[PDB]
């Protein structure tokens, strides 16, 4: 599955993932793309705060879903 992650500045990162990939996996992939440390990353999908050890399928993240990096 392909997803999009938008940074704080609105920059789009395209990621290739699987349903079973954890949010922690996703965060390391962001770090590789942008240099943003996993411990600085807060991810939201469909207004839900995403926990490191849950999976994309656990949040109903699907093909062509968009996640946001946020402050809080
Ligand atoms: Zn795919
Ligand atoms: Zn696999
Ligand atoms: Zn994976
Ligand atoms: Zn894998």
Swiss-Prot record:
Describe which stretch of the whole protein the shown chain covers, with first residue, last residue and complete length.
Answer: 1 to 72 of 685
Where in or outside the cell it occurs: the entry states: Cytoplasm; Nucleus; Mitochondrion outer membrane
Q: Which residues carry this modification: Phosphoserine?
A: 65
The entry's stated outcome for residue 72 to K is: No effect on ADP-ribosylation
Effect on the protein of changing residue 7 to D: Impairs ubiquitination by CRL2(KLHDC3) E3 ligase complex
Changing residue 72 to A has the effect of: Impairs ubiquitination by CRL2(KLHDC3) E3 ligase complex. Impairs ubiquitination by CRL2(KLHDC3) E3 ligase complex
Question: Glycyl lysine isopeptide (Lys-Gly) (interchain with G-Cter in ubiquitin) crosslink - at what positions?
Answer: 6, 11, 27, 29, 33, 48, 63
Task: Tell me what effect the entry lists for residue 72 to G.
Answer: No effect on ADP-ribosylation
Q: What is the effect of changing residue 65 to D?
A: Phosphomimetic mutant that binds and activates PRKN
Record site: Interacts with activating enzyme = 54, 72
Q: What does this protein do?
A: Exists either covalently attached to another protein, or free (unanchored). When covalently bound, it is conjugated to target proteins via an isopeptide bond either as a monomer (monoubiquitin), a polymer linked via different Lys residues of the ubiquitin (polyubiquitin chains) or a linear polymer linked via the initiator Met of the ubiquitin (linear polyubiquitin chains).
Q: How does it sit in the membrane?
A: Peripheral membrane protein
**Ubiquitin-like domain residues:** 1-72
Residues bearing PTM (Microbial infection) ADP-ribosylthreonine: 66
Per the record, the domain of life is Eukaryota
Source species of the chain? Homo sapiens
Q: What is the protein name for this chain?
A: Ubiquitin
* UniProt-annotated site: Essential for function, residues: 68
Posttranslational modification: Phosphorylated at Ser-65 by PINK1 during mitophagy. Phosphorylated ubiquitin specifically binds and activates parkin (PRKN), triggering mitophagy. Phosphorylation does not affect E1-mediated E2 charging of ubiquitin but affects discharging of E2 enzymes to form polyubiquitin chains. It also affects deubiquitination by deubiquitinase enzymes such as USP30.
């Amino acid at each position: 599955m392909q997803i999009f992650v938008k940074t704080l500045t609105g920059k789009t990162i395209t990621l290739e993932v699987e349903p079973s990939d954890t949010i922690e996996n996703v965060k390391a992939k962001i770090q590789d793309k942008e240099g943003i440390p996993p411990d600085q990353q807060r991810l939201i999908f469909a207004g839900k705060q995403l926990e490191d050890g849950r999976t994309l399928s656990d949040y109903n993240i699907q093909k062509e879903s968009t996640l946001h990096l946020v402050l809080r």
